[PDB]
Amino acid sequence: VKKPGSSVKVSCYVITWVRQAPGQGLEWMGGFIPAMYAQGFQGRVTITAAYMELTNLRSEDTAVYYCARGPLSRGYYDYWGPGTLVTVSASTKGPSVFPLAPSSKSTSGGTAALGCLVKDYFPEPVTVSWNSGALTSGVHTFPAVLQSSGLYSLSSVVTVPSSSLGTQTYICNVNHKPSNTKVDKRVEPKSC
Amino acid sequence: EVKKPGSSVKVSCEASGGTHSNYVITWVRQAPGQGLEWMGGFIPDFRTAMYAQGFQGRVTITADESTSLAYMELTNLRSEDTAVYYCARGPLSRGYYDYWGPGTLVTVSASTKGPSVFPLAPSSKSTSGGTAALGCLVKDYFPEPVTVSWNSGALTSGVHTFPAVLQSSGLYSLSSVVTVPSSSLGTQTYICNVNHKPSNTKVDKRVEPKSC
Amino acid sequence: SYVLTQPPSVSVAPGQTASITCSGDKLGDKYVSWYQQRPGQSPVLVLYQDSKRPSGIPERFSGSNSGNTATLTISGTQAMDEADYYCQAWDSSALVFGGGTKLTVLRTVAAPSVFIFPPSDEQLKSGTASVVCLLNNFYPREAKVQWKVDNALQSGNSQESVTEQDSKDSTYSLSSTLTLSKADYEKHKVYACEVTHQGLSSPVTKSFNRGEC
Amino acid sequence: SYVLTQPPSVSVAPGQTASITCSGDKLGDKYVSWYQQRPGQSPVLVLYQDSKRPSGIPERFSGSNSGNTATLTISGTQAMDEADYYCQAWDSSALVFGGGTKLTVLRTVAAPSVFIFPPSDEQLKSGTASVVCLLNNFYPREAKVQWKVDNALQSGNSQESVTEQDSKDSTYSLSSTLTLSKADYEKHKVYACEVTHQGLSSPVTKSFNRGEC
Amino acid sequence: TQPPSVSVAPGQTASITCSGDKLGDKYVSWYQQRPGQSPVLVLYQDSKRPPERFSGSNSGNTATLTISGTQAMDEADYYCQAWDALVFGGGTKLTVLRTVAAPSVFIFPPSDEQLKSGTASVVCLLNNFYPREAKVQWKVDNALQSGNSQESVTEQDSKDSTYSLSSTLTLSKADYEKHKVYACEVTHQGLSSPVTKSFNRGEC
Amino acid sequence: SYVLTQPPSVSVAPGQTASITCSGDKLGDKYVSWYQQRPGQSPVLVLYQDSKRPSGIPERFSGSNSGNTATLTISGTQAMDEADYYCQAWDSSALVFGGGTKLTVLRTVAAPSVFIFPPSDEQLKSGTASVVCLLNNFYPREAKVQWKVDNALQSGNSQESVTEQDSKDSTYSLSSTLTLSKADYEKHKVYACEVTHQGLSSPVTKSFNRGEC
Ligand SMILES: *[C@@H]1O[C@H](CO)[C@@H](O[C@@H]2O[C@H](CO)[C@@H](O[C@@H]3O[C@H](CO)[C@@H](O)[C@H](O)[C@@H]3O)[C@H](O)[C@H]2NC(C)=O)[C@H](O)[C@H]1NC(C)=O
Secondary structure, three states: OOOOOOEEEEEOOEEEEEEEOOOOOOEEEEEEOOOEEOOOOOOOEEEEOOEEEEEOOOHHHOOEEEEEEEOOOOOOOEOOOOOEEOOOOOOOEOOEEEEEOOOOOOOOOOEEEEEEEEEEEEOOOOEEEEHHHOEOOOEEEOOOEEOOOOOEEEEEEEEEEHHHOOOOOOEEEEEEHHHOEEEEEEOOOOOO | OOEOOOOEEEEEEEOOOOOOOOOEEEEEEEOOOOOOEEEEEEEOOEEEEEEOOOOOOOOOEEEEOOOOEEEEEEEOOOHHHOEEEEOOEEOOOOOOOEOOOOOEEEOEOOOOEOOEEEEOOOOOOOOOOOOEEOOEEEEEEEOOOOEEEEHHHOEOOOOEOOOOEEOOOOOEEEEEEOEEOHHHOOOOOOEEEEEEOOOOEEEEEEOOOOOO | OOOOEOOOEEEEOOOOEEEEEEEOOOHHHOOOEEEEEOOOOOOEEEEEOOOOOOOOOOOOOEEEEEOOEEEEEEEOOOHHHOEEEEEEEEEOOEEEEOOOEEEEEOOOOOOOOEEEEOOOHHHHOOOOOEEEEEEEEEOOOOOEEEEEEOOOEOOOOEEEEEOOOOOOOOOEEEEEEEEOOOOOOOOOOEEEEEEEOOOOOOOEEEEEEOOOO | OOOOEOOOEEEEOOOOOEEEEEEOOOHHHOOOEEEEEOOOOOOEEEEEOOOOOOOOOOOOOEEEEEOOEEEEEEOOOOHHHOOEEEEEEEEOOEEEEOOOEEEEEOOOOEOOEEEEEOOOHHHHHHOEEEEEEEEEEEEOOOOEEEEEEOOOEOOOOEEEEEOOOOOOOOOEEEEEEEEEEHHHHHOOOEEEEEEEOOOOOOOEEOOEEOOOO | OOOOEEEEOOOOOEEEEEEOOOOOOOOOEEEEEOOOOOOEEEEEOOOEOOOOOEEEEEEOOEEEEEEOOOOOOOOEEEEEEEEOOEEEOOOEEEEEOOOOOOOOEEEEOOOOOHHHHOEEEEEEEEEEEOOOOOEEEEOOOOOOOOOOEEEEEOOOOOOOOOEEEEEEEEEEOOOOOOOOEEEEEEEOOOOOOOEEEEEEOOOO | OOOOEOOOEEEOOOOOOEEEEEEOOOHHHOOEEEEEEOOOOOOEEEEEOOOOOOOOOOOOOEEEEEOOEEEEEEOOOOHHHOOEEEEEEEEOOEEEEOOOEEEEOOOOOOOOOEEEEOOOOOOHHHOEEEEEEEEEEEOOOOOEEEEEEOOOEOOOOEEEEEOOOOOOOOOEEEEEEEEEEHHHHOOOOOEEEEEEOOOOOOOEEEEOOOOOO
């Protein structure tokens, strides 16, 4: 997996290049006559000879390139060469903490559930502590789940006596070393 | 037995024969699964009565001492007046109602009105197979039945007329679908012929492809 | 005692020929006669004296008697030929009726044709939208329709009405309505009708955007 | 207009206390009364003048009225206290009934007890053999009994009977009896009665070998 | 702009449409790309071609890619190429369905020699049928059975797509000596209702 | 030939006492030893000479011998006691091992505690909402959730994550998250979360109106 923002080169009558993201279609960038560049990738494509260089790779550049060659002035391309695959991964982003307010209705069981939700963080892993590690009874930390976009999410939940809701301070402590991030978020019942 | 719309009903409760009663009669109505409502009051000792605001105009409470019976007359019944009518009797001046009598079920059957016709647009996407399905919708009518015929009854090859289905409100819905070749969609006149005898409703409705 | 035996049942497909046998001991030396009985109806004679048919019965029916087996032959069997068949004969001054033979015709499977119709323009002026999805001719009665608006399965607001198979046919025809209300039809761009049934390789979905018709 | 409000529904498990609140404006000044209505019956008084109770009601019922809420307190809830409770109050020379409250007692799943009784010797001599399987004191109602005769699932020739629900416990009972002929029972060697039902981690079979004892 | 997907039965004619203003004035080229394989040209300059099942045209505002005698190896994603800069339209997917087919069910009794070896084998055979999903049930004397039957299946023929299934039921000796009636019940698409073929023990 | 008999299998819930019987004619007249074998492991000794036990065995293990039956009594049954047990005996200058007996230690079914937490008021500023439905301790892994928003079953926009059972327990914990676009959350007043699982008489649904009432 190439590092994001780096540069990669592709080495391949008129010679042209086409990019195909997985299950998205064919994308054309330019051609070269032993140069022409597409409007979309005017600033990130360099053609030299023959090979072409891409710069400033981002999330959407994951695709497979093909070396296609066509006649001088035929308007069509044949001999689609073997495809070359690339894989960007992502930018590294810290988490954002949101509270999960405890139920505002009293329960006969005298039990309520709290929790802080962590999402939009890359790469794994993250650690969560409650009250600077002072509370470790009935604590759950569900495993991270890969979100559709490409980031992660994680949840933590603690069950405590109902009478201990408005008389104690509950704080979600979250740290993320890869982004040198540390955030504390208070969890309190919604005002009504 | 179904009470016809515009009629009246009489709910009967035991009443004092002309002596000390020591109880205030009442009435209560409960639409199916909708809670309880107040209707009117009565104090045997004092002939006076007391009616609720909602049913102010449609109620009237009278009693007969010879038969030791009292009843309330409700007139101009509507579909909203299909419910179960109770009859309670509480203490004289305490105000809590006790000894609820057996329920009485009163039913009415909506009203009669003609149907409304709306057309279902034919296929918009070009179907080269040669089969475009038309059809007009007939709904919001009562009572059974209604008849649908196409092109003044001259088209009976492929016509489908699904049986009527009872809507939630109480009225009825019915459909009718005809399949015709695609190439004959912009050259022939398709007309529904919906007829409802009880309401003497006869309405036509052209059906054509929606403009695009 | 004398007994005539017949196969309990027989199965065939439309347009084929079915053979029903009323066999016995030296049964070829007696005059047999076959009776056809539809369920709930009195028996009607179909053959007397082996092969001499009566007047009115279609020529398709034909039978013969020889050896120890007598056969009734049907050609071009259709959906109207389903009925029990009974054999007859006289022996020792005692009538004998053969065991009931059940002739069944297995009807072919036909896939449904499905359409979706948007709601009329006029109805929206009355504050009510009703999207109707239809299933045309299809034999196997088992069918399932599922309305999903904006890819969200819905339930509790749909009704179903079906007809009966045509006399000279075997296919039903189904239709389903989705009663909505304005301020709900005004959203959820994508509307869809999903139908599952035999014949179809996979469920087929017919959709239409709320806008642009 | 004067309106009273109650929570649409309340659910509790047996042995716990349930609270129902009828809330209005300055409702503490009135004399609220509570009515209990079981389905398809007539409401019966349960509380008058806040707390006082009539004669013929269990001591469990209790209520209160202060501030802006009148609360009905039910203790030791059991299966016979599922019904609708309504709130009353006189105001501005017009009676006012509260909104309907539905109270539901959540039942507890109880696994069945399954037995199998072989056919008695005298009945066997009579010429018919019967095998009976009994499931008693189980809940919910759904339960499937599947017989087996030497790893051969049985279809037909089986009668099913279910008793009425028990009010105190809310548990049914089900007897499934298998009837065979003498010779058929004499053949084969193993019999079993497979039961599948909620509350059982895996199906339980009570088998016996005939002739052994 | 191209249709998202196209579905056709083998041996039928399928048309792929590439739409665009002035497309009729311009030319068009078509490429075929199998899953995981580089695209290969199928047609250039409207009708110019480098088998003969391929056929294309370009006029007005639509160019049609017509295929004749579609077979199982014609499935792929097709693209429409035109110049205006190089513009590539959304790909179109073509599938080769094949149609349902009922299975011809046969039942054979146990040979008259195996019995001398104290073992019986009743075999119920299913002939050509395309949809692989099939189910057989051995009910002897109207009583389902399980745990004593094995299924073996082959692969579809080259010029066909139909499987074939054989279910062997092994009965220990002195067990086949009873249960007068044997049967084999099969369920599958195409069949209107389950079809059971049954044979009496000693009918002949 | 000398043969001993043992029960095929035994099932017991935690915290109870299980007894396994090794039976045989004149069996109690001699000395017996019990072997415990875990799957894929060399058997080990748990008892020798009826009641004498070796070092390394806890006080829970116990056994008795008398008459024509030898009993292995186990106290404080737990998941670590899952194994097969064999009964040993000497006779006629030949060893004799009894048939294997399997021990099963299941855990009693539990019922989950379900909570639903509305979306934050700090997410919405980020143009997204996420309603989370949490299922608390519950042993049987098989569980289901079905997000219903405005009474419209949804699919394709929710994920489930689950942890492993605790050391001194056998209970999982499941959380289900429903991610909605900002605009879509502004509609559909009602929201719900339904759950089905063993130990629940009927499915339980916890809902919260979008108004945050
Ligand atoms: C004022 O006084 C009483 C008010 O109740 C009225 O007289 C009532 O009339 C009834 C009806 O006739 C009488 O009772 C009847 O007795 C005979 C017995 O054979 C029979 O007619 C019925 O079985 C009925 O029971 C009785 O005179 C009296 N009711 C009583 C005493 O309960 C009277 O008409 C009222 N008005 C005037 C102007 O007096």
